[PDB]
Amino acid sequence: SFIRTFYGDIAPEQLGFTYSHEHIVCVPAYWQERDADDLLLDDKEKSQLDVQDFADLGGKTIVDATAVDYGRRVLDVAQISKETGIQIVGTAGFNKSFLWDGKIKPELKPIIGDFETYYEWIENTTTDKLTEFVVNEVENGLEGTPYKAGQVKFGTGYNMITPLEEKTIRAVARAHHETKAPIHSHTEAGTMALEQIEILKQENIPLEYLSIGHMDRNLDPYYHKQVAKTGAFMSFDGIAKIKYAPESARIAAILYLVSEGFEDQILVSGDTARKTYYKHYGHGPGLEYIAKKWVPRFIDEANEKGFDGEKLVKKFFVDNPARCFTFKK
Ligand SMILES: [Zn+2]
Ligand SMILES: [Zn+2]
């Protein structure tokens, strides 16, 4: 088996230290149209400086969760990978339905069809044709480029799975059946994981093939244990996001799952989606933050609370991503 990166399929042992959910260069139509400039990562050289910080700290791989509705700049990301040496796992599929109001860029029309918005495209395209689109991103390349995606994604809304969202879940599940690519989901504020899981079960998807994004947004031990029992990977990707929770709260939730025997299912990242989050755009914590500052604190705090901090860090950033992001064949 293998992990599919922009520059080739690699052995799991080659993945190394990994951030499991990030954004690098992207210009989401929905946000661009609303002049939300902070959500546009629109400078390749600035993004590259953060990725280089990661590389300098011993980082090896970034999973780039930018989906088709989030304004990919695949060629820029590929160039960054080439220049920094950081391996990139790209993402096929969809991010979240509120983005679908955004206009379809000219480059997508030859691939997707002559549709004004993502909503129009998704509403008027059969599930099977949506599956074809996702499969082609994994097998042929993203957005007319030769850089293939290494995971397939879908997303749901705040305490909602709409009919169209459900359609995309089924399209992505079926794309998994064809390609065997790992599956990632967006949960809005950490909601709807159990309902996502029910749809995937109807589609005959083994749940250990799924990583669920944004579990750190809903810090509920009972809910987390319900999700973990299915075998799904659980992504804590809001590290440093004090506006959502203090770091202690995220760390406590992680350690609860460890105490209940689920350490092998935990993934960690920063979901760095803003200029103000990048060191070299707006002087935020940057891609350096987790490796440089969070890791030593987690190790220390976990050790203080009786855990094996170093072993856990190795699992969260090395062993677990190597298990999660391998194709299922
Ligand atoms: Zn997301
Ligand atoms: Zn994201």
- Nearest partner of 151 among 127, 186, 126, judged by Cα: 186
d(CA 265, CA 249): 18
Cβ count within 10 A of residue 38: 13
- Nearest partner of 16 among 237, 264, 314, 270, judged by Cα: 314
Cross-strand partners of 266: 234
- Residue 159 CA to ligand 2 center (angstroms) comes to 18
Q: What are the structure tokens assigned to 311, written together?
A: 């072993």
- Residue 168 CA to ligand 1 center (angstroms) comes to 15
Q: Give me the phi and psi of 98, to 5 degrees please.
A: -65, -25
- Residue 73 CA to ligand 1 center (angstroms) comes to 17
Q: What are the structure tokens assigned to 39, written together?
A: 């959500």
d(CA 160, CA 166): 10
Experimental method: X-ray
d(CA 84, CA 90): 16
Give the ligand at the shortest distance from the Cα of 97: 1
What's 12's DSSP letter?
Answer: G
Name residues whose C-beta falls within 8 Å of residue 65's C-beta, 6 or more positions apart in sequence: 21, 22, 23, 91, 95, 153, 184, 186, 213, 271
Distance separating the N- and C-terminal Cα atoms of the chain: 6
What's 143's DSSP letter?
Answer: T
Give the ligand at the shortest distance from the Cα of 273: 2
Contact 42, 25 (CB under 8 A): yes
What's 305's DSSP letter?
Answer: T
| Encoded amino acid at 252, one letter | A
| DSSP output for 67-132 | -GGG-B-HHHHHHHHHHH--EEEEEEE---GGGGGSBPPGGGHHHH-S-SBHHHHHHTS-HHHHHH
- Nearest partner of 92 among 7, 171, 149, judged by Cα: 149
Q: Is 261 left (phi over 0), alpha (psi -120 to 50) or beta?
A: left
Cross-strand partners of 152: 92, 183
Q: What are the structure tokens assigned to 305, written together?
A: 């609370």
d(CA 160, CA 64): 25
- Residue 315 CA to ligand 1 center (angstroms) comes to 22
Residues, CB within 5 angstroms of ligand 2 (ion): 65, 271
- Nearest partner of 275 among 83, 43, 115, 54, judged by Cα: 43
Q: Where are the alpha helices (DSSP H) in the chain?
A: 29-32, 44-56, 74-84, 109-112, 118-123, 127-139, 163-179, 193-202, 221-228, 247-259, 279-282, 289, 295-304, 309-314, 320-324
Name residues whose C-beta falls within 8 Å of residue 235's C-beta, 6 or more positions apart in sequence: 20, 21, 184, 211, 212, 213, 214, 215, 216, 267, 268, 269
Strands 3-5 and 8-10: antiparallel
d(CA 125, CA 253): 40
CA 313 to chain centre: 19
Q: Which is it for the CA torsion 243, 245, 251, 255, positive or negative?
A: negative
Q: What are the structure tokens assigned to 24, written together?
A: 């690098």
In CATH, which superfamily holds the domain spanning 1-329?
Metal-dependent hydrolases (3.20.20.140)
In the chain, where are the structural domains located? 1-329
- Residue 257 CA to ligand 2 center (angstroms) comes to 22
Q: What are the structure tokens assigned to 253, written together?
A: 């939730």
- Residue 23 CA to ligand 2 center (angstroms) comes to 6
- Nearest partner of 29 among 117, 125, 141, judged by Cα: 117
Give the SS3 label for residue 158.
Answer: coil
- Residue 84 CA to ligand 1 center (angstroms) comes to 25
What's 42's DSSP letter?
Answer: -
Give the SS3 label for residue 261.
Answer: coil
Give the ligand at the shortest distance from the Cα of 213: 1
- Residue 306 CA to ligand 2 center (angstroms) comes to 32
Cross-strand partners of 149: 90
